[PDB]
Amino acid sequence: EYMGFSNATFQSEKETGDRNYAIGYYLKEKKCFPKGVDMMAALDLYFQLCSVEVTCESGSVMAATLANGGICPITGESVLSAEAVRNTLSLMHSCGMYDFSGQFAFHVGLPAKSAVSGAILLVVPNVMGMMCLSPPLDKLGNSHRGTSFCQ
Amino acid sequence: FVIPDFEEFTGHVDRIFEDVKELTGGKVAAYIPQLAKSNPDLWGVSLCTVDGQRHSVGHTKIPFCLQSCVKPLTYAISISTLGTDYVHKFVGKEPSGLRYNALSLNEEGIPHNPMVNAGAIVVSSLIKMDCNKAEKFDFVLQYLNKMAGNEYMGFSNATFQSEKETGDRNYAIGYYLKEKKCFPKGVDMMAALDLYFQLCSVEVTCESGSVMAATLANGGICPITGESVLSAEAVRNTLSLMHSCGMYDFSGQFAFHVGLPAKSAVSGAILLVVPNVMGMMCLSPPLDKLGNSHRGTSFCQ
Amino acid sequence: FVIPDFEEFTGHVDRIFEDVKELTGGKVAAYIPQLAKSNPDLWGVSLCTVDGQRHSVGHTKIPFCLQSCVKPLTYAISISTLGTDYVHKFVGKEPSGLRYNALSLNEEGIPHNPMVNAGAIVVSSLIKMDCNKAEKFDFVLQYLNKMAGNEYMGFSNATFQSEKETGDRNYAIGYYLKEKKCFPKGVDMMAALDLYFQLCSVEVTCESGSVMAATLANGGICPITGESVLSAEAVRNTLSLMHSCGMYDFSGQFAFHVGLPAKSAVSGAILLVVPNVMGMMCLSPPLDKLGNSHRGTSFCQKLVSLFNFHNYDNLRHCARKLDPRR
Amino acid sequence: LSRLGDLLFYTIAEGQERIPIHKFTTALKATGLQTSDPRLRDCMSEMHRVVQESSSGGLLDRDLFRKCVSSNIVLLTQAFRKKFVIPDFEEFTGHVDRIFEDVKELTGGKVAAYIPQLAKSNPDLWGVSLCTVDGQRHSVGHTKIPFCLQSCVKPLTYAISISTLGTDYVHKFVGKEPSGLRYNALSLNEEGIPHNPMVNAGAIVVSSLIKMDCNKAEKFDFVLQYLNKMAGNEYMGFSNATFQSEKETGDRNYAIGYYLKEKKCFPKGVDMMAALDLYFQLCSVEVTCESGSVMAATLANGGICPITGESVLSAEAVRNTLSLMHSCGMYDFSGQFAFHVGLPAKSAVSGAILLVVPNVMGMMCLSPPLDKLGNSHRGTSFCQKLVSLFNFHNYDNLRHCARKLDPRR
Ligand SMILES: NC(=O)CC[C@H](N)C(=O)O
Ligand SMILES: NC(=O)CC[C@H](N)C(=O)O
Ligand SMILES: NC(=O)CC[C@H](N)C(=O)O
Ligand SMILES: NC(=O)CC[C@H](N)C(=O)O
């Protein structure tokens, strides 16, 4: 499905994503990365991936892949292993939305991943996947309309 | 002169020098590659009265870096040029309580003091922010030479490249400060951080730095050249921070026991100051737990 | 005497006294409702030269509680009667930079310094732990009376019953210290915690308060009576902590602009000390955000800028700043 | 076999029964060989402690001196018997001083269009120093002012690589022929490598060969240790002011580095920036004419520092770099220099000329003013004049020629 790249956002985050640079150098001092691994290339890739563009239709299928045991429903390819999905969903439930991981497992109970672009990659295991877009965010860095819709 | 009996004074200094030479020390600061190269047995002391009396025992002439002893100097340089209110509008003036790394800021959103790594970058950011890198270092080096009475004022690019390629924590603080709007508008972070690494890598002997500390004791007048390098208020501020913030966490246990304005460094330097009397500097590489030389700090006590 | 021409010296203080009188702060005391009842328009100062030469202008006749200004004293009681080595086994000697409540211990598990509330409880626990509660209070009171030269020394029971029914952070600190086992063996924490409240609730006038801070401006010997209250090492030990830890977070700011050992207090007291010169005790109930009197801090700031009392003046020439005791 | 030092002292003395102590400390350096050499350091060390308890209170005595100076006996014999390779050193320095005065009148121009930290230097700064292959030294003028070693480390750093990596590995990546296209020279030879190590395009590549596996600190630290041994542990610093210049504003070098990386002319798995950064660091090393004269006297010899006698450079390294500085050291002006001077010299925008006279001596001039091609105006004149009055040209001393000063007699 649609898969682009917001270079404008990519350049807005490289030049202004100052906290993400502190973490990269903070990690580098603690030897958190593997041996013989450049942090700048790894940090840069994180900026690139965060800039990937999709639509809600593309995101919904992207979430449905996690729902259907890491097998995309509309192509059927075994793109992801069963262990990857179980590990991924079990972490979005407890770590998907950071501080709002609670108050979402509490009110919604589903593994959903929030973003500052308004998206909420909502996953219903063995049923469907859903992505809700609304740029307006609340204090905890989650979309307000999206999380109200989920509840 | 302020010490008429200087001949007997050296009789006590050398006795204490040999008294503490038997002690061992802690780690030798191996977390940056270059400083591990130093021989931990180096031990020397130099002093300079505000009249010009000078004595040296040990390895005083072996060069070493002002890895953190340049923070009071660059601070005094900034205060003397821009004014107290302007400088401290960007950097606090109170002790932090954490280590010198201290990737954190006070309630106001500015670094705690001009002696922690976060504050040393900001004061380095304030030195002639509208010029290029060569002029920035030359402006600071010019006063440092005058502080030292035109003594040996060198540079150790081996350390500068070692730190610039390995000092990742200082990069974390630099990008943390830039994210919190801790720099004046239109000022680049990397230029300030790079300048801070350059100042940290300035190489001085104990003789060069003993007169450099005696300037602060003499209050902005180099005793052996009659200069007027620093304003009276600038040194009064530097000694007020270097007292309560000079040795980081060990500021207590030093103000308690020694009660003098001193500044430590990971290279073993201790830029001791005795106001209205003299300025002393001690070199001993092997550090202690909180980032100061075991022999030097015990010698001061 | 160390201050000749006393008329000239006091005259300058009087002019500064009126100048600071216009400034108004706020937030007298969020807690201890008994302290929130004090008059915000109350402002008094007093001094006592190391040789008895004393002056006082303002509201120096109104008793006020000695909250957190007895910490440098009660520390001096323990440091002299138990030595420096024993006392600092249980309390550090470095600033915390985390306010005075500061439910936080240093790296090695002991409270940061005697001046924070966590350290004042421990040092208060060291004073005659084998005796009963009446004797523990009386033991410190006898030295406290001797420090002030048998001047006025009351006890505001109104403020002591407050700070105990409503003073809960001190209890949380007290039980926190018990969990970490940073008390001497065979000691009841509650008895030591209660002793801290009582010492805090002692009330003195500025005129009597200025006698204190002139005792320890000297080498412990009282200026009025000439007695020998505290050991000379005790005064050095506590002064070196008041400079670094006296005002808590504001210690750096105070040491920068004033550079004298001063101890803050929620009652508005500031036990300012000028070593080998005199001892000051300002009073202004309204505080700043950091727990310091707005008028008292302003007076200390202005006085140092005119009298050369800073720790790092007289470098070569500096400003004139009047005659420095010569 | 017998040690004739006892009779040698009688020759050293003027023949009188006594001599004041004051006359021995002073006026003894007239022979050129300084009193600060490490070789004779042992003599000065011991005498300082024996004076307190000697029952003479100011007498060194002959018997005591002979016993202590035992292992270093051979060196002193050549010094005072005038058996060095340059005798009558007073006349040699006397002529040198004369041209130093005469050449001082000249004035060039265009001190530095770029590297602003070089444009701040005093145009009227002029000095020279020479340290013969035997360590005999004489300096006059402003020799004590540190100056950057830009483009003088190129012959040295080339010698470092070859002596540690072989002649065939180094020259796989850099040619050995002059280019005649200035020192910047964004151009490669027919076989796709920089024309010679002396141009900027080659100096970066040879700088890339020095410990390509180590980190930045050790790469610089490796070379600086050799440069200390080459200079005999004389003054050797690092001008960070000029290193921060030539890196923010030195842009033609960056183009060469990226141009070279484009042609894949670096070794395998080597970062151009790390090699280019080292080129700026080596270029930024500051040395005085007095200290920098021992350099160009180390490689005037067969790779041994004349002062300490340490073996620092392979004789093949010195032979190769000397054969290379002659035709490529001074860029376009190499032919003009080789025509009138005919000596291995290396230019610099900081006024330095690393003059070399193999088997004889090695000089180091200093004149911040430049000529059009990037060579010091005053320094070049001294070399041209000096050769015309000392026969240092390679193709002189045919059989008898004219008198031409003393012909080794
Ligand atoms: N929602 C998010 O995790 C936003 C990530 C974003 N790249 C940031 O650094 O702030
Ligand atoms: N406190 C120190 O001595 C270290 C100084 C050095 N600039 C660093 O932060 O690594
Ligand atoms: N000055 C203060 O910090 C007040 C302390 C508080 N009254 C107590 O008893 O602990
Ligand atoms: N001609 C030279 O000496 C070159 C100077 C210096 N290496 C530069 O390229 O800027």
Author numbering:
A (entry chain C): 302 to 452
B (entry chain D): 152 to 452
C (entry chain A): 152 to 477
D (entry chain F): 69 to 477
The authors write:
The glutaminase enzymes GAC and GLS2 catalyze the hydrolysis of glutamine to glutamate, satisfying the ‘glutamine addiction’ of cancer cells. All glutaminase enzymes share a catalytic domain containing identical active site residues and a conserved mechanism for hydrolyzing glutamine to glutamate. Here we demonstrate that the ability of GAC and GLS2 to form filaments is directly coupled to their catalytic activity and present their cryo-EM structures which provide a view of the conformational states essential for catalysis. Filament formation guides an ‘activation loop’ to assume a specific conformation that works together with a ‘lid’ to close over the active site and position glutamine for nucleophilic attack by an essential serine.
We also obtained a 3.3 Å cryo-EM structure of the constitutively active recombinant human GLS2 (K253A) mutant that formed a filament immediately after the addition of glutamine alone (and prior to substrate depletion), as this mutant does not require an anionic activator to be catalytically competent. The tetramers are arranged in a side-by-side architecture and each successive tetramer is rotated ~48 degrees relative to the filament axis, with the helical rise of ~66 Å. Interestingly, in the filament structure for the constitutively active GLS2 mutant, Arg320 (which corresponds to Arg387 in GAC) forms the same type of salt bridge in the absence of Pi, as that seen when Pi binds to GAC(Y466W). The formation of these Arg-Glu salt bridges, together with the substitution of a less bulky alanine residue for lysine, allows the movement of the activation loops into a space that otherwise would only occur when Pi binds, and likely explains why the Lys-to-Ala substitutions within the loops yield enzymes that no longer require the binding of an anionic activator. An additional conformational change that occurs specifically in the constitutively active GLS2 filament structure, when compared to the tetrameric apo-enzyme, results in a hydrogen bonding network introduced by the activation loops. Hydrogen bonds that form between Arg250 and Asp400 of GLS2 appear to ‘stretch’ the alpha helix containing Asp400, causing Tyr399 on the N-terminal end of the alpha helix to insert further into the active site where the substrate binds. Following the insertion of Tyr399, Glu258 from the adjacent dimer forms a hydrogen bond with Lys440, which displaces the loop containing Lys440, and therefore makes space for the insertion of Tyr399. As a result, Tyr399 is now in close proximity to both Lys222 and the substrate, which is necessary for catalysis.
